Amino acid sequence: DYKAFDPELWNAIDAEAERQQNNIELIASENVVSKAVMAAQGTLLTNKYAEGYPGKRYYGGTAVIDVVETLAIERAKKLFGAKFANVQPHSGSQANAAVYMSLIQPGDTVMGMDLSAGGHLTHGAPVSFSGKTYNFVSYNVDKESELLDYDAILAQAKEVRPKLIVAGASAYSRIIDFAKFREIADAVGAYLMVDMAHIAGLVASGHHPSPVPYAHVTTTTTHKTLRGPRGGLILTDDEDIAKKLNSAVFPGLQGGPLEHVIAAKAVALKEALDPAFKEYGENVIKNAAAMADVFNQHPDFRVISGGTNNHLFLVDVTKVVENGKVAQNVLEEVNITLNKNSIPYEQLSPFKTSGIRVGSPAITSRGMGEAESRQIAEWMVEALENHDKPEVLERIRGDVKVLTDAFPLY
Amino acid sequence: DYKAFDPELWNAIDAEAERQQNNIELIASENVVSKAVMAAQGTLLTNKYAEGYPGKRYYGGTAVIDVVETLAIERAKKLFGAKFANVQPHSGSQANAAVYMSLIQPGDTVMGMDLSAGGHLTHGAPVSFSGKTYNFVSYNVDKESELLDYDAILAQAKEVRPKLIVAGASAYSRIIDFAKFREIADAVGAYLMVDMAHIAGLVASGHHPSPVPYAHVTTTTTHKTLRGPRGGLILTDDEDIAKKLNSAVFPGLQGGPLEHVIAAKAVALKEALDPAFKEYGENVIKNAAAMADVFNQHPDFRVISGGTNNHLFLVDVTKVVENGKVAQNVLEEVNITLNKNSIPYEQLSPFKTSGIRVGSPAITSRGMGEAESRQIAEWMVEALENHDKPEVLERIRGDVKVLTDAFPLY
Numbered sequence: 001d002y003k004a005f006d007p008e009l010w011n012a013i014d015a016e017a018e019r020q021q022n023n024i025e026l027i028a029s030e031n032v033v034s035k036a037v038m039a040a041q042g043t044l045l046t047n048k049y050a051e052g053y054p055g056k057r058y059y060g061g062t063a064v065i066d067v068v069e070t071l072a073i074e075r076a077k078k079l080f081g082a083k084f085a086n087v088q089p090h091s092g093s094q095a096n097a098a099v100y101m102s103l104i105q106p107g108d109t110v111m112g113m114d115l116s117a118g119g120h121l122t123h124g125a126p127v128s129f130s131g132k133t134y135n136f137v138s139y140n141v142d143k144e145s146e147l148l149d150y151d152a153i154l155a156q157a158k159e160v161r162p163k164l165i166v167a168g169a170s171a172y173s174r175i176i177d178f179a180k181f182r183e184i185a186d187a188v189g190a191y192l193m194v195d196m197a198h199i200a201g202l203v204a205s206g207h208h209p210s211p212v213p214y215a216h217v218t219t220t221t222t223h224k225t226l227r228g229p230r231g232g233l234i235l236t237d238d239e240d241i242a243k244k245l246n247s248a249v250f251p252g253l254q255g256g257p258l259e260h261v262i263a264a265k266a267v268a269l270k271e272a273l274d275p276a277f278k279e280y281g282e283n284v285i286k287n288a289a290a291m292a293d294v295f296n297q298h299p300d301f302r303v304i305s306g307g308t309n310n311h312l313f314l315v316d317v318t319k320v321v322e323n324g325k326v327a328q329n330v331l332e333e334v335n336i337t338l339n340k341n342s343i344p345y346e347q348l349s350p351f352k353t354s355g356i357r358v359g360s361p362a363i364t365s366r367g368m369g370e371a372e373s374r375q376i377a378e379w380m381v382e383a384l385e386n387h388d389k390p391e392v393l394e395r396i397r398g399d400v401k402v403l404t405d406a407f408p409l410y
Numbered sequence: 411d412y413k414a415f416d417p418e419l420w421n422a423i424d425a426e427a428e429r430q431q432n433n434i435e436l437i438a439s440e441n442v443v444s445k446a447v448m449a450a451q452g453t454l455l456t457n458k459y460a461e462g463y464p465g466k467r468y469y470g471g472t473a474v475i476d477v478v479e480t481l482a483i484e485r486a487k488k489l490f491g492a493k494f495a496n497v498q499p500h501s502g503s504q505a506n507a508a509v510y511m512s513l514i515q516p517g518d519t520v521m522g523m524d525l526s527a528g529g530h531l532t533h534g535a536p537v538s539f540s541g542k543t544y545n546f547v548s549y550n551v552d553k554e555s556e557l558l559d560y561d562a563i564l565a566q567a568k569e570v571r572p573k574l575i576v577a578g579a580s581a582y583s584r585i586i587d588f589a590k591f592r593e594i595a596d597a598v599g600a601y602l603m604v605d606m607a608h609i610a611g612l613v614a615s616g617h618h619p620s621p622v623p624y625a626h627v628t629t630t631t632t633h634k635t636l637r638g639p640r641g642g643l644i645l646t647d648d649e650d651i652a653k654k655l656n657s658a659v660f661p662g663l664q665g666g667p668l669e670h671v672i673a674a675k676a677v678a679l680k681e682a683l684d685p686a687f688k689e690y691g692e693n694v695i696k697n698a699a700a701m702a703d704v705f706n707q708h709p710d711f712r713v714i715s716g717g718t719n720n721h722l723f724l725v726d727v728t729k730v731v732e733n734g735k736v737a738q739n740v741l742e743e744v745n746i747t748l749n750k751n752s753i754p755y756e757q758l759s760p761f762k763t764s765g766i767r768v769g770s771p772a773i774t775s776r777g778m779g780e781a782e783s784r785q786i787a788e789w790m791v792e793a794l795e796n797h798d799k800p801e802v803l804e805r806i807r808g809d810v811k812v813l814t815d816a817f818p819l820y
């Protein structure tokens with residue numbers, strides 16, 4: 001009945017479902033969640049106000065909510081090996097804000113990865129509250145290797161004297177050495193915060209090393225590789241920091257939490273505890289590597305750092321099309337959606353960029369394997385090399401429908 | 411059948427659905443959303459990253475999200491009579507942070523309603539980002555009348571000279587005069603921001619005059635009287651302000667918006683544009699006045715300000731029990747949920763308080779009318795008077811059950 005009351009809206013919703021089905025989604029930060037995760041978010045837990053924490057709420061009627069939120073906290077702790085977790089943050093951005101509010105004061109100096117080399121807005125962009133409220137100094141990757149250089153970062157930290165060093169990225173493909181990051185922090189008396197949003201699913205699956213034992217605080221989105229609902233999570237092993245973080249999230253930054261989304265976080269966390277989640281990780285890794293190999297081997301394309309050891313990579317497209325916006329547009333013409341992306345030391349406009357970013361998680365969740373991944377990468381190459389040949393694009397689009405038909409979304 | 415995979419979680423959701431069904435929910439900030447609102451939040455829109463705004467997004471394949479977000483925006487504009495809307499804020503709290511970021515600077519001075527008299531945490535509590543970043547100086551209500559004194563407030567503003575005045579409350583039962591707050595702001599060169607979270611539904615129905623033509627910026631939750639999903643929303647008629655508001659929400663404070671929630675916002679807003687929504691407004695007013703009438707007349711209970719012209723009211727219970735907190739524990743024992751609440755010039759610990767806050771929107775959304783409202787108040791009065799007599803509560807509990815069964819939740 002309700003779809004009949006509001007056809008403009010439900011038309012659009014059904015349209016997005018079909019668009020997800022008919023597109024090869026390579027946006028590295030997307031995934032395809034389980035029906036269970038969506039169903040948890042679609043429940044009447046949305047009607048409950050629950051300011052406060054389990055056992056100390058500011059409203060009655062919260063005993064069941066407590067069981068739910070407590071499930072979520074305990075499942076995170078268990079899955080990531082942390083002594084404390086906070087599952088209330090609305091987003092990754094909010095989780096990160098809460099941590100800054102807990103460990104440093106406005107105007108304090110913070111080191112963060114450079115936007116262009118893979119850092120997130122909340123790691124010090126001047127347009128973000130992060131850059132506005134704190135004095136962020138950025139570190140980069142090496143210009144020749146495109147890898148983190150832990151000695152250079154140490155040398156810079158010794159000069160800069162930060163209160164906090166932030167590690168983690170949106171577009172770095174290689175394994176990060178968290179033990180080195182903590183060594184660096186320790187050497188200049190800084191806190192270390194790790195934002196593992198992109199890699200949390202791989203930390204869970206055993207395919208990326210955990211920052212949890214080395215960071216004072218670890219943040220993540222519950223979406224992305226962890227294949228959860230859209231939201232945030234915070235972890236730590238320090239009881240005192242945990243009190244500060246809890247106060248920072250509420251009443252410091254947020255009001256009432258989204259308990260329906262929290263339910264959905266509990267769902268996702270239990271899915272990631274299942275042994276099958278190790279299989280998903282292994283496949284995420286293989287699928288991304290297979291796609292990258294195609295570009296490595298092709299002479300007109302270069303993969304940043306020469307490859308990947310996680311779920312994503314970047315490709316410099318500028319020998320074949322003008323810039324990354326162009327490549328993003330062309331691939332979209334063949335129902336392959338990704339995002340243009342700055343590469344390290346990017347020479348072009350931020351609105352244009354020299355690169356594209358590709359990820360495996362969504363296709364891996366639809367059940368695709370190495371060969372499909374390889375084929376996709378061939379079609380991307382082919383579409384960019386023939387971007388001005390409508391007839392080729394038309395043909396690729398049809399080949400892609402065969403593949404999407406063959407691995408249905410749900 | 412995924413519920414079989416996680417029975418702890420899903421049993422808990424069932425428990426909460428039965429708690430909500432067998433409970434008279436009088437927490438004034440709660441409501442009961444339509445199946446359609448829940449369904450929209452349970453969609454696969456949760457899979458989609460949409461940093462940016464309609465037409466100017468960071469990622470590809472966002473043409474359908476844009477239709478959905480544009481519906482929410484267009485509906486908020488039609489419904490509230492505003493020229494601009496931003497529907498991305500994750501919460502009421504995030505919405506208010508964004509306005510401050512847009513209109514004033516850290517350290518600037520702001521007047522907002524005092525917490526004891528029903529201002530919100532984000533209107534200046536020293537444990538909120540609001541009081542930590544900006545110099546909040548509170549106005550109160552008259553000590554006698556327990557009403558807002560616009561003369562007193564004008565004079566205080568003339569001493570204080572705030573950059574911004576914030577009006578709106580979580581616990582004031584009377585009409586707020588937004589024309590007066592704007593003439594007050596105007597007299598000192600201040601912006602006026604109204605946070606209408608509690609009354610947005612009544613504004614929507616015509617039962618409370620609107621702040622929108624008087625406030626430079628209006629904020630609200632989408633949950634509460636507007637009967638929508640948990641979320642925030644921001645309105646203005648000034649274009650230059652709108653641009654800032656948008657930059658503040660993203661990349662200023664947030665990252666990716668919750669487009670499934672935004673779909674749900676769109677749903678709720680079309681519901682509120684339906685002429686049936688005015689009938690709901692009407693009953694919300696009446697049901698609250700009826701529950702309030704019972705306490706006025708009872709000699710052991712005073713109702714703050716003497717009564718109400720909106721969806722809520724406060725009651726001093728200290729005659730009959732020690733404090734608000736105790737009231738709340740007792741009433742919960744008969745399946746009546748509300749919250750303890752400071753009364754103006756609260757004497758007692760804020761962990762205790764002298765009052766209860768009562769609201770009609772949830773019970774009105776279940777179909778109850780004046781007789782049931784009145785009866786519910788009788789039951790409350792009765793349970794507080796008989797608070798250590800378990801055989802009585804047991805009886806009230808049973809009579810409550812008849813009424814909850816009679817007005818089933820969905």
Ligand SMILES: Cc1ncc(COP(=O)(O)O)c(CNCC(=O)O)c1O
Pocket residue numbers: 029090091092093094120122168169170195196197198221231232459664665666667
């Ligand atoms: C590392 C990192 N941290 C925080 C966030 C922010 O999360 P919210 O959008 O939930 O605020 C992101 C999003 N990154 C977007 C991307 O790479 O596509 C991120 O990659």
Ligand SMILES: Cc1ncc(COP(=O)(O)O)c(CNCC(=O)O)c1O
Pocket residue numbers: 049254255256257439500501502503504530532578579580605606607608631640641
């Ligand atoms: C006036 C007002 N403004 C903002 C908020 C905060 O919204 P979020 O909780 O979505 O951040 C509230 C919550 N008020 C809680 C209550 O009345 O019980 C509020 O009452």
